Short mmCIF file of C-alpha atoms in Angstrom, two decimals:
data_model
loop_
_atom_site.label_atom_id
_atom_site.label_comp_id
_atom_site.label_asym_id
_atom_site.label_seq_id
_atom_site.Cartn_x
_atom_site.Cartn_y
_atom_site.Cartn_z
CA UNK O 1 73.50 98.61 52.78
CA UNK O 2 72.07 96.56 49.90
CA UNK O 3 73.22 93.01 50.64
CA UNK O 4 73.70 90.55 53.48
CA UNK O 5 74.98 87.00 53.45
CA UNK O 6 73.24 83.94 54.88
CA UNK O 7 75.33 84.17 58.06
CA UNK O 8 74.09 87.58 59.17
CA UNK O 9 70.43 86.70 58.64
CA UNK O 10 71.04 83.57 60.70
CA UNK O 11 72.73 85.64 63.42
CA UNK O 12 69.91 88.21 63.49
CA UNK O 13 67.13 85.62 63.65
CA UNK O 14 69.10 83.84 66.38
CA UNK O 15 68.88 86.93 68.60
CA UNK O 16 65.24 87.63 67.77
CA UNK O 17 65.21 91.40 67.23
CA UNK O 18 62.32 92.55 65.00
CA UNK O 19 63.61 96.10 64.55
CA UNK O 20 66.14 94.87 61.97
CA UNK O 21 63.84 92.66 59.87
CA UNK O 22 62.72 95.78 57.98
CA UNK O 23 65.99 95.65 56.05
CA UNK O 24 65.35 92.06 54.98
CA UNK O 25 62.11 93.45 53.52
CA UNK O 26 63.81 95.35 50.71
CA UNK O 27 66.45 92.65 50.39
CA UNK O 28 63.61 90.40 49.27
CA UNK O 29 62.26 92.73 46.59
CA UNK O 30 65.39 93.30 44.50
CA UNK O 31 67.34 90.94 42.19
CA UNK O 32 64.18 88.76 42.09
CA UNK O 33 65.87 86.59 44.70
CA UNK O 34 63.99 84.88 47.51
CA UNK O 35 64.56 83.21 50.87
CA UNK O 36 63.29 79.87 49.53
CA UNK O 37 66.35 79.72 47.24
CA UNK O 38 69.50 77.75 48.04
CA UNK O 39 71.57 80.88 48.72
CA UNK O 40 69.75 82.18 51.82
CA UNK O 41 70.31 78.84 53.58
CA UNK O 42 72.99 76.22 54.12
CA UNK O 43 73.98 73.74 51.43
CA UNK O 44 74.89 70.68 53.50
CA UNK O 45 71.56 70.24 55.31
CA UNK O 46 69.28 72.85 53.75
CA UNK O 47 68.28 74.51 57.02
CA UNK O 48 66.37 77.66 56.07
CA UNK O 49 66.08 80.89 58.06
CA UNK O 50 62.85 79.90 59.84
CA UNK O 51 64.35 76.68 61.19
CA UNK O 52 67.44 78.54 62.45
CA UNK O 53 65.16 81.05 64.17
CA UNK O 54 63.11 78.30 65.84
CA UNK O 55 66.16 76.33 67.06
CA UNK O 56 66.66 79.02 69.71
CA UNK O 57 63.61 80.58 71.37
CA UNK O 58 63.31 83.01 74.27
CA UNK O 59 61.38 80.79 76.72
CA UNK O 60 58.20 80.77 74.62
CA UNK O 61 58.01 84.15 72.89
CA UNK O 62 59.74 85.49 69.78
CA UNK O 63 59.40 88.71 67.80
CA UNK O 64 61.31 87.96 64.57
CA UNK O 65 59.55 84.91 63.09
CA UNK O 66 56.10 86.42 62.42
CA UNK O 67 57.28 89.56 60.54
CA UNK O 68 59.55 87.27 58.55
CA UNK O 69 56.47 85.28 57.56
CA UNK O 70 54.41 88.21 56.29
CA UNK O 71 57.51 89.52 54.50
CA UNK O 72 58.05 86.15 52.80
CA UNK O 73 54.40 85.60 51.86
CA UNK O 74 54.25 88.98 50.10
CA UNK O 75 56.53 87.84 47.25
CA UNK O 76 57.34 84.20 48.03
CA UNK O 77 57.09 81.41 45.46
CA UNK O 78 55.33 78.00 45.54
CA UNK O 79 56.54 76.99 49.00
CA UNK O 80 55.65 79.55 51.72
CA UNK O 81 59.09 78.87 53.22
CA UNK O 82 57.08 76.65 55.58
CA UNK O 83 56.43 73.85 53.10
CA UNK O 84 60.17 73.64 52.36
CA UNK O 85 62.47 71.35 54.32
CA UNK O 86 65.93 69.77 54.42
CA UNK O 87 67.24 67.59 51.58
CA UNK O 88 69.99 65.96 53.64
CA UNK O 89 70.66 62.23 53.79
CA UNK O 90 70.38 62.35 57.58
CA UNK O 91 67.35 64.70 57.54
CA UNK O 92 64.97 64.23 54.59
CA UNK O 93 61.47 65.70 54.79
CA UNK O 94 62.12 67.17 58.25
CA UNK O 95 60.57 70.64 58.23
CA UNK O 96 60.13 73.51 60.69
CA UNK O 97 56.72 72.38 61.97
CA UNK O 98 58.31 69.19 63.31
CA UNK O 99 60.78 71.38 65.20
CA UNK O 100 57.92 73.49 66.57
CA UNK O 101 56.20 70.35 67.84
CA UNK O 102 59.49 69.05 69.28
CA UNK O 103 60.09 72.25 71.28
CA UNK O 104 56.65 72.05 72.96
CA UNK O 105 55.26 75.46 72.01
CA UNK O 106 51.58 75.86 71.11
CA UNK O 107 51.96 79.42 69.81
CA UNK O 108 54.47 78.79 67.02
CA UNK O 109 52.55 75.69 65.93
CA UNK O 110 49.45 77.90 65.72
CA UNK O 111 51.18 80.47 63.51
CA UNK O 112 52.73 77.84 61.24
CA UNK O 113 49.48 75.92 60.75
CA UNK O 114 47.43 79.09 60.16
CA UNK O 115 50.01 80.53 57.74
CA UNK O 116 49.87 77.58 55.35
CA UNK O 117 52.04 74.76 56.72
CA UNK O 118 50.07 71.68 55.67
CA UNK O 119 50.31 68.76 58.10
CA UNK O 120 50.97 65.96 55.61
CA UNK O 121 54.77 66.10 55.22
CA UNK O 122 56.69 62.90 55.89
CA UNK O 123 59.91 63.32 57.87
#
């Protein structure tokens, strides 16, 4: 167990099980390869892992997003995976914080804004 693909991270974050995110931890450290890159995401839209996780939420509580954030911030680059968004023709500038507002959840908005998601991004 050294590698996943984008699909299995998407599947895991869809379910929302934190007990597996530990693996993603080491999968961030090696090969100097990060989640903000174009490989751990789709290529058509640009939907990253955080967006995919948010697009399905257990009523109003999740357990996979937060650990993913402190894992990413430990070795992430310029964009804290929260300042990054889609580069699609249909969706340009649309980031995860817009999704969090759209799904009517105070908690996730709180985490995103306190973790470094600046509210100045044009969708």
